[model samples]
Target: GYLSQQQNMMQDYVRTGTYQRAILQNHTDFKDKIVLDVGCGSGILSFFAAQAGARKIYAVEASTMAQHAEVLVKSNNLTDRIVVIPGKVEEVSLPEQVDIIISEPMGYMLFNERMLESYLHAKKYLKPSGNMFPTIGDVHLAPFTDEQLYMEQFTKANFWYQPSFHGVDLSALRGAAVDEYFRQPVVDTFDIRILMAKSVKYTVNFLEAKEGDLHRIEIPFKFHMLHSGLVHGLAFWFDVAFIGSIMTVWLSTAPTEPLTHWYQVRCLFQSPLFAKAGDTLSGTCLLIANKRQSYDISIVAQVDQTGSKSSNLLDLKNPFFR
Candidate 1:
């Protein structure tokens, strides 16, 4: 079920031709170089390396999808150059060191599933002179307000008490409903028109990143209104770059672009604060990635306007933090 879904994601990746063009553009560096493609699901990236004249490729996948990738390689006549290794990267043995290590390991916020930990294992196999494709990445945060999103995802539908409904009073359940929304980070695509300001919140560079880096993150920000709108919650997305000795390629899952399988992340503040021109929204956020898989996002902020001020501190231990 998962591998088939990955096939469709492959179609989208090729449509964007992002990694395709990047690999092709950096073909000079790949030619005759030994390569390692981590989490190579469809083996498309390995094919790109081969197409660029890579002498050998160690394509590692942790799932059964590696079987399909083997078929793809054979039909593409790349069986001679690419070796499909089905298992965790640490468990697989590559014939020799590689000059380049490439993988698309980003999740919605760049660390959701935290696959980079595995990718880092592959890093140990890289030659001292080797280069990793995505040298850098980050979780970006912007503020946004969507009336529909607010109504659909955050607002408790308390109208069950209206006369038209007659006798139903699920109004008693509003607490559970609102509490449920805050239980996990909200994952969804967003329209760009709702953005309140532009800013980035968390970052990491793959060449030096590790599981330990995911422990705790704290970012402080102050957004002066670009335009007036309600500040719903922080809009989170990631940006990455494919590096090379020469020119480089940059990509984003930002809301302004076409949505990918990794849609923009929206963690709501719930209160739905309003803002106008020149209003200042200032805040600090704490991010913890642990056994839960989803980030425990805690934010504190104050809205200031015309000498009036209001503040909020969202702490992880408090269910009432928001």
Candidate 2:
């Protein structure tokens, strides 16, 4: 069952290619360096580092997937260079501090699974002069208008809006049903044309960031409406840059870029706001990390149009509403 997940990432060329180039293209940064690969799912990253001339690579994974990675390392005649460590980053002990740490710890919205925490924790194992693959992560958000998608959700909820359905009163469940549908932030690919305005960028400095720093994040944004339309929700995507010695490679999930496994995320409003071309929508996005390593996301914005004003709230939590 989990094999498909690894296969899915292997097929994501945009993702795999960027990571490969980050190491292969910049041998100066990887050659003769000791590396630690956090969450080395299938040892793919370790394999890349090994090919890049890394002296040694400690591939750490908490899941049984490490078993497969071990065999693959040997099959590729890299057993001397790559060591599969079947343990969590928090508990794994390395022979010596690493010169470089590489990982793909991002989840939906950039902080979904809390894997970044583990990666940050592993920083203790890195030498002071060590480098991180992705030195910075930038998350972008913009208001969008998608009537067709909104209607799709409304139509799905309409099934329970009827006063009587199959000789039963289901109208009372209409609000709850609609709430459930809209509250789940849709994770899918979309066109950039749907965006109503320029997005705001929220940067997360991975190289110098601590685990507690991600406990709560608040980003302020003001979007100047590009054209008149019904504001249905906000769309989000992220970009990460591998700041290496020779080159800086970016793996972007932007709508304008090639599609990847991590598609753009959309958080719909329960009540859509109407605005004109020159209207302005201002608000702050709050993300509070929960115990489950996911986040409780909330968007509160007010739209100011000529002689009219409206406010809307888009609240959602990971793994469904809290």
Candidate 3:
């Protein structure tokens, strides 16, 4: 089944010529250089490296992807130049140092799949002057509208009323409210670029962040439309750049134009009350990369309406009415 899928996809790649364009545009210096294609699905990029005159290529993939990649490499008559390895990036060891490391390691929220950890490990094993295809990336956020009704309806349907006596069974009411409120729409989006070999720190107490270190940013939305919906959550995205290679993570409901198999991420919140027309919502966000451990991070957020008192909804000890 997987090999069949690969054959179909190979036809598509040939028809679209996307792989040819990407390699020609990005990896202009492939002559006689060893290259590593991380997460080499269908072995398309590996083939590109070979076509560009790469001396040798390591096509790495986890799951059943490597099997398909291997078949593609053989069918294309490039097996002698491209070797497909089946394993996770952290577990796989290259036979020799590579001059370039490339991968399509992005998830819905850019970090959801935690590909950065794999890239970091690969970098440590690469040659001193080895280059990452995407040398930098950034995480971004934006305010949005048009999601309240969906969340409200979702909560309402999720907790259908049942026959109960203890004060009408309000146990699930708070949960429903919280869930609905926090389920915000993606109105805007942005990204921050993180350079290779950089370490940083951050602290987040619920939605509040005390300290952080960050790299790049891209925000697309600015204001909310009245009669649309409240700004319930943030939609996140990322823009990654290699020397010349670039990829984007939407992190929003926006449809993917070219459709590269990436999805968006939504971060919801439980606002005290629904935002209405004429309400200007503002907030601050912090992204911290902890220097101590891999995959450790802290994100803090706080939003308030213009000319209104800011509320600390995350304070567990505060009185419910307070």
For each candidate, what TM-score against the reference? 0.84, 0.93, 0.62
Tens digit of lDDT per residue, candidate 1, span 1-322?
2766777768776324888787888887799999999966445788889988999998887667788888888898888899988888878788799899989777656765667777777887889868888778867888788677667655444443234455555666665656555544567776677788877556677887664666676777788788876777777788888888777888778777776767666666656777887888877776766574446666776676743233333323222211
Clashing pairs in 1: none
TM-score of 1: 0.84
Question: Candidate 3, residues 134-249: lDDT per residue as tens digits?
Answer: 55555544443435534554565445443364647655565555543333222222232211111121211111211131221122223342432454445455555444434322
In candidate 2, what are the lDDT values of residues 233-314, reduced to their tens digit? 8898999999999888999999999988888888888778888888898888888777765777767777855433333333
Question: What's model 3's TM-score?
Answer: 0.62
Each candidate's lDDT (Cα)?
Answer: 0.72, 0.83, 0.50
Model 3 bad stretches (over 4 Å): 1-20, 147-229, 245-260, 272-322
Residue 53, model 1, lDDT:
93
Which run of 10 residues does model 2 get worst, by summed lDDT? 313-322
Q: What is the C-alpha RMSD of each candidate to the true structure, in Å?
A: 4.5, 2.6, 9.8
TM-score of 2: 0.93
lDDT score for candidate 3 against the true structure = 0.50
